[PDB]
Amino acid sequence: IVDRAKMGDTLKRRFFYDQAFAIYGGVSGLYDFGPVGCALKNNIIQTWRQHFIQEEQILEIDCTMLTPEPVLKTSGHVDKFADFMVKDVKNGERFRADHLLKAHLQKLQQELADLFVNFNLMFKTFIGPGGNMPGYLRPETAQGIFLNFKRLLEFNQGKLPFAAAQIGNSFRNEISPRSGLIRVREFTMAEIEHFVDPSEKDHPKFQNVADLHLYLYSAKAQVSGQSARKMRLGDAVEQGVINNTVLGYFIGRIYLYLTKVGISPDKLRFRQHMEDCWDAESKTSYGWIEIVGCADRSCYDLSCHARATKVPLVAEKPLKEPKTVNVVQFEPSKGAIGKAYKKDAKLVMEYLAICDECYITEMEMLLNEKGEFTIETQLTKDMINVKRFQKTLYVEEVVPNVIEPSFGLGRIMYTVFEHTFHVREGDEQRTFFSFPAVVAPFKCSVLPLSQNQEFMPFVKELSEALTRHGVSHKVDDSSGSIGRRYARTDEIGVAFGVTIDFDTVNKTPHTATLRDRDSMRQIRAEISELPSIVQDLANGNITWADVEARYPLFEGQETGKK
Amino acid sequence: IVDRAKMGDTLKRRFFYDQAFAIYGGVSGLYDFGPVGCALKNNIIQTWRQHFIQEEQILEIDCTMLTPEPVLKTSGHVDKFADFMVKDVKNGERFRADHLLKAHLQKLQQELADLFVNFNLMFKTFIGPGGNMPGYLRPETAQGIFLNFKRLLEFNQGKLPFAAAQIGNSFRNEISPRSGLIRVREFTMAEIEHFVDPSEKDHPKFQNVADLHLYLYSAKAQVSGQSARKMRLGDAVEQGVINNTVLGYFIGRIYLYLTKVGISPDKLRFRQHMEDCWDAESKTSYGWIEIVGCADRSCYDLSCHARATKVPLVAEKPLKEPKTVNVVQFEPSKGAIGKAYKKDAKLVMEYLAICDECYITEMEMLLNEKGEFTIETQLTKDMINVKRFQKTLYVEEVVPNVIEPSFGLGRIMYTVFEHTFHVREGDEQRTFFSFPAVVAPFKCSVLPLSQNQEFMPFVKELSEALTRHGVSHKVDDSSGSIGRRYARTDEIGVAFGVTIDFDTVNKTPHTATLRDRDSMRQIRAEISELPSIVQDLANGNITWADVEARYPLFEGQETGKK
RNA sequence: GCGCCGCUGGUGUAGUGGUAUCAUGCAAGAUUCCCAUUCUUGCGACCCGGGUUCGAUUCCCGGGCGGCG
RNA sequence: GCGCCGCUGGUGUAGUGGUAUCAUGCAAGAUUCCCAUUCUUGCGACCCGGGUUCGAUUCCCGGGCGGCG
Numbered sequence A, B: 001i002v003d004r005a006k007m008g009d010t011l012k013r014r015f016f017y018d019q020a021f022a023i024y025g026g027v028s029g030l031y032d033f034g035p036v037g038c039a040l041k042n043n044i045i046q047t048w049r050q051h052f053i054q055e056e057q058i059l060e061i062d063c064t065m066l067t068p069e070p071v072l073k074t075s076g077h078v079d080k081f082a083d084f085m086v087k088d089v090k091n092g093e094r095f096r097a098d099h100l101l102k103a104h105l106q107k108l109q110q111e112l113a114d115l116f117v118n119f120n121l122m123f124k125t126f127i128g129p130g131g132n133m134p135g136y137l138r139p140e141t142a143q144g145i146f147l148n149f150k151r152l153l154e155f156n157q158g159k160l161p162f163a164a165a166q167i168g169n170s171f172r173n174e175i176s177p178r179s180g181l182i183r184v185r186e187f188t189m190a191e192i193e194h195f196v197d198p199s200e201k202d203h204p205k206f207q208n209v210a211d212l213h214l215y216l217y218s219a220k221a222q223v224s225g226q227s228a229r230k231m232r233l234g235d236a237v238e239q240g241v242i243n244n245t246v247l248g249y250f251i252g253r254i255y256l257y258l259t260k261v262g263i264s265p266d267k268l269r270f271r272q273h274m275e276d277c278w279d280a281e282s283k284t285s286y287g288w289i290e291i292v293g294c295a296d297r298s299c300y301d302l303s304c305h306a307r308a309t310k311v312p313l314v315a316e317k318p319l320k321e322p323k324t325v326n327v328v329q330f331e332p333s334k335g336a337i338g339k340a341y342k343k344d345a346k347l348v349m350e351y352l353a354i355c356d357e358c359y360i361t362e363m364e365m366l367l368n369e370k371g372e373f374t375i376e377t378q379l380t381k382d383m384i385n386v387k388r389f390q391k392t393l394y395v396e397e398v399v400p401n402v403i404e405p406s407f408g409l410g411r412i413m414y415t416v417f418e419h420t421f422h423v424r425e426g427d428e429q430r431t432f433f434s435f436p437a438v439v440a441p442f443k444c445s446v447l448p449l450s451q452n453q454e455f456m457p458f459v460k461e462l463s464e465a466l467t468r469h470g471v472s473h474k475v476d477d478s479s480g481s482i483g484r485r486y487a488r489t490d491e492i493g494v495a496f497g498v499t500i501d502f503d504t505v506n507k508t509p510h511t512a513t514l515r516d517r518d519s520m521r522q523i524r525a526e527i528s529e530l531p532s533i534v535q536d537l538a539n540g541n542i543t544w545a546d547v548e549a550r551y552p553l554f555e556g557q558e559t560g561k562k
Numbered sequence C, D: 001g002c003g004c005c006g007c008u009g010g011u012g013u014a015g016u017g018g019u020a021u022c023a024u025g026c027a028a029g030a031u032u033c034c035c036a037u038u039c040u041u042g043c044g045a046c047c048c049g050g051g052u053u054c055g056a057u058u059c060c061c062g063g064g065c066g067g068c069g
C-alpha cells in the first residue's frame, strides 16, 4: 500500500542515501547517507538522547569499534558467528564440519585441513602491524559497556540500578545482504544496558506510561495462532502479560519514542519472546521487521568476562540488619604440612576443607590429649590449628540482572520512510515526506516568490535570523516557479516554508507567509517573529493547529509589482 | 607548568577515559570514553556542528568506515602506508625492499618471497565471508566525500562553491602508539571539504573575522628562525601573509571555534606549510601538537578517482558571453576505412586526427577533383567526408579547488584538558576543570546542603525542571559534606551548582544558591527561575559577571533547623 | 619493532617463597549546617601464561600494559 | 554461495557491430506573481575487465550491482 518503487526513486534522486562506493561499482550492504538522510539520522539520534539518556540520566560512554579476539571468544561470538568451510576448485563453497559428517573423501585448524586429505561473519583484522594480535570489528556495542562495568558502577557510587548506553556503528559480514537498509553489513546501533537488583523490579516512574494503549503480541497469542492485541500498559502488567513495571516502563517509553519520530502506532507492535523480553516491530512492505531488540543477559556477559579475566563483576548491597555467623573452620599451617608431605599435602588440603564442625571438634578433641590425629587415604601433628568465631556480614553481593534494548537506527529510519511517504492529489510527480517537525531534515524552507531582486534583502535577513535561532533551514532561490520550489522542498520533507511576496516588501509592517508541508495551508506573520514560531514548531512546543489558531490565514496577496 | 600526572589521575579516577579492554590487560592506542568524557565529546561535536555545518550551511554526509581496496589504491594510501617486510626466526622485523637493497642472502608478491631465497598501517580486512574482496578500515573520512561529489554538487544545484563535511572515526594501525590520546589507533575526525571556483577566491563573509588578532607562524618566520607573531587577520591577508580571504575566513572561524571550546588563545597558533595551507597547533606538555590539519587536494583525489572510474568529476559554469568557434575537422567513415584496411586503419585514424586545417582543405581540394588522396606510411577514397562549422560554447568545465580542514577531536579534547586543568589554593586535593559552559559535561550540579529529608522534594522538582529545560545536570545527594560534593562535582567540571539550604525550605518565596565553578562565588535566586538561568549560561547567552550583576550575592544563611 | 626500569584495592603505597600494611576513595550511622569537618563501622587489591618448588604475588622465562629514548 | 532476467544522462526510457532517441531534472534568459506555468537556449549517459572483430555500448565469457526464490 506504499509505492516502494516511487518512494525509492525519491530517496535516490534527492540523495537521502545511496549505494556506497557507487562510482566504483558499489558494495552490497554498504550505504552512504547524503545531506538529507544524514540530517535526519542526526535528528533521530538527538531525539533519542533527550528521550533515553537525558530523561533516565543514563551513563553514555564511547568505546572503540576495534576489538581483540579474546573478548569475542569469551562472549561467544567467535564460535557462534564463525568457523571454516571448504571450496570447490571452480566455485561452490560447502560447510566443513558438515561435509566431514556427510562422509567421503573430497569435492563433488590446518590439522583438519590435513585430515580432509584422506568463514566468519564478524569482520576479521589484525591490531598492530605484523599482526600478532588478531581482532574483529565489533558486531554490537554492548561489550564495551560490560567491560567498563566497574568504572560505571563506581561513577554511580556503587549503587543500583543504573544504565549505560552506547550509540555507534556495528558490523556484520553478512552472507547475502538484500532488503535495502534492513539487512546491511554496517549499521548504527543505539544500545542501552539497564542494570537492576533482581529484588527491586519495580519502576518508580511507571505511572507515566501506564495509560498508553499499545499493540502487544504475547507468546500465548503467537502459539495459539492469535493476533496481537491493544492493551492499556498498566493493565497488561497487572494481568501479568508483561511481567513487571521495569519492563513495562521501558516498553512505554520505547513506544513514545518510536511514535515521536514518525512511526505509525497502528503499524507498530511489541512481540514477546517465546520458549522476559518484548521486541518492537514495525509493519512495512517487507512485512513485520524488528527495529528494537530486547535481550536479557543476566548471568551471561558479566559472568563470562568475570570468569575469563578473573575480575569480579558484581554490585554490593548493604544489609539493613547485619547477619552474624558462627564459623568453625580448620586453620592448617601451609608451610608445616607442605614441607612434611609432597603431593600428599595437596590432597590433604583437598580434604581438610571438606569437613563438618562435628568432625572438626572431634579432631581437635583428639588433638588436645596430645597431640596428633590421622586421616583417610596421613598423620597430622601441630601443622593444624583449629578455629571458631563470630563473623558479621554488613553486605551481600548482588549479581545484577541486565535489560538490553537494542535500536537499529537504519531500520527505524527506513520505517519512518515507508510510514511518512506520500504522493499528492493530482500532480503525482509531487511526492512528500510527513516527517514530524522534531526530526525533519530542515525545519524551514526560505523562499522568495519570484526572482525579483527586492526580495533578496528579506531572504538574507530571514536566513541569518534562522541560523541565529539554531533553526536548520534551506533557502531555495532558484530560477523556477513557487510551485517547483515548493515541490522540491516538500520532496525532502521540509516541515515548513516561508514565502516572501510583494506584500512583504510593500506593506507597512513586514509580514511573510508560513506554509505547512502536509496541508499546504498557510498563515501570515511578521517576518521578525517567524524564526521563533518555526523554532516552537521544531521543538514540538506547539502544533500547526496551534499556529492557525493564533495567526491570520492566507487569503491572497493584496499587492503586486509597484 | 601543568601537573600532567595529577591531571591524569583525575581523568582516570573519574573515568573521563580509560584504556580500552583494560580488564583484559588493555590494548595500545585504544581508549574508551566514560560518562564525563563522552558527554564532553558530544558537546564539542555539537558545538562544532553549530559552528561549521550550520553557519556555512555545509552538506553533512555519513559514509561507511568499511572501504574496498581499489578505492584506497587509487587514493594512494595502499602504497604510501603499506608494503611487506621480513622477520627473523626469533623476533627482529626488518624492511624488505630495504634489506634487498642492503644485499646478502637472508637474516642476521610471493614471487619476491621466492626471490629472497637466493606490513600495512591501514587496518586490513575482507568484505563478504570467503574473502574474495579485500578492504580496509578507512584511515580518514574524506574519501566518502570525494566519491559522492556528483550527488553533492547536484544537491547544491550544480553551483559552486559548496562544502561537504563528515564526522566520524578513522583508523591507523600505528607502529608504537605513545603520547596518550595524541597518537592513537582509532580517533574521531571532523573533516570539511570546501569546493571552490579557483577564480572566485574571495569570501563574502571575511569581514566577520578580519578583526581577530591571531598568532600566525609563517613559513618565512620558520625558515628564518623566527617565532610566530600576532596579527590582525585582515592585515595578514592584505599584506599577503595569508594568500586569500577564503583561507583567512576559514582560519578565523577555526580560531573562534577552538577558543569557544576552551583552548587558550595564547597557546594556540596557525602554522603555515612550507616548501596555501595553515595548520592549527596548540601548545601542550608534549609541546606544539597539530589539532587541525589543512590540506589542498586540488588536482588530486577528484582526478584520481575520475581517472580510475572513468567518471568525470567536474563542476560546470555558464558563460556570461557564449564563445563561438570555427571547427575544421576530418569526418572519416569508420566502417569504410576499417573494412578496407586491417591494422592499417587504426594507424590511419591515429593520423587523420592530427592534422592542421590548412592540410585538411588541401586534402579536400585534392579530393573534389575526383576523388581520392593518399598519405604517409594509404590511398583514401570516399571513406572521408570533411567538415567545417560554427560551434558555440555556453559553458566552461571548472575543476574545483578543494580546502580540507581536518579536526582531531581527541587532540582537541586533550588540549582542553591541559588548558583548563587547575588545582585550588590550600586543599590541593581539590582539582577542577575550567570547561566553558557551552561544553561542560553537565551544566548544573543539584545538591542539598545536608542529608535532611525536607530537602528532597526541592531537589526532585528542581531535577525534573532541569530535564524539562533540556539542561544536563547531576544530582549529588550522597552522605558527605557540602564541601565533599562541591569537590566531586568541580572535579569533573560541572560549570554551576545549586545548593538547597534551610533558607530554601523556610523562607517565603523559595530561593536556592547558584555557585560558579571557577570562582566559587554565589548568588541567590527563586528556585523556579534557576533552570532558565543555568540554561542561558549553558547556551552562552549570558556570562557569570552578567549573573552577579542581576541577582543578590550570597551573604550567608538566615535560617537553620526549625 | 629495539633498548631502559616498573606493574599490589577505584587512586597511591607497605611488605612477603605459605593471600597482604597504611592512606585516600566510596558505602552506612551518627556529627556538622556553605566549601574533601570529625568519630565509629563496612567494601575493595598482588597484570596474564608457563617454568622451577610441596606451594609464587614474591625467583626465572615469555606475553600484555605503562614510563624513558 | 546457487538459480532466475536485467544494467544506456541525476531519474526513467528509444535504439544500435561504426558513440545514441525521447521524456524528466537541473542551468540560463524571458514569461508568470502562491502551489512541478509557458517559450527559447544549454548541461549530462551506453556498469567494469577479458575475448572474438578492422572496430563492441551491441555478440560471448567472467566479475560488480540490482530485482525474483
Ligand SMILES: Nc1ncnc2c1ncn2[C@@H]1O[C@H](COP(=O)(O)O)[C@@H](O)[C@H]1O
Pocket (backbone or CB within 6 Å): A140, A172, A174, A181, A182, A183, A184, A185, A187, A189, A290, A291, A292, A293, A406, A407, A408, A409, A410, A411
Ligand atoms: N544486518 C543488519 N542490518 C541492519 N540492522 C540490523 C542488522 N542486524 C541487526 N540489526 C538491528 O539491530 C537490532 C539488534 O539486533 P541483534 O543485535 O542482532 O539482536 C535489531 O533489532 C535491528 O534493528
Ligand SMILES: Nc1ncnc2c1ncn2[C@@H]1O[C@H](COP(=O)(O)O)[C@@H](O)[C@H]1O
Pocket (backbone or CB within 6 Å): B140, B172, B174, B181, B182, B183, B184, B185, B187, B189, B290, B291, B292, B293, B406, B407, B408, B409, B410, B411
Ligand atoms: N594517530 C592519531 N591519533 C590521534 N589523532 C590523529 C592521529 N593522526 C592524525 N590525527 C588528527 O587528525 C588530523 C589530521 O591528520 P592527517 O589526516 O594525518 O593529516 C590531525 O591534525 C590530528 O589532529
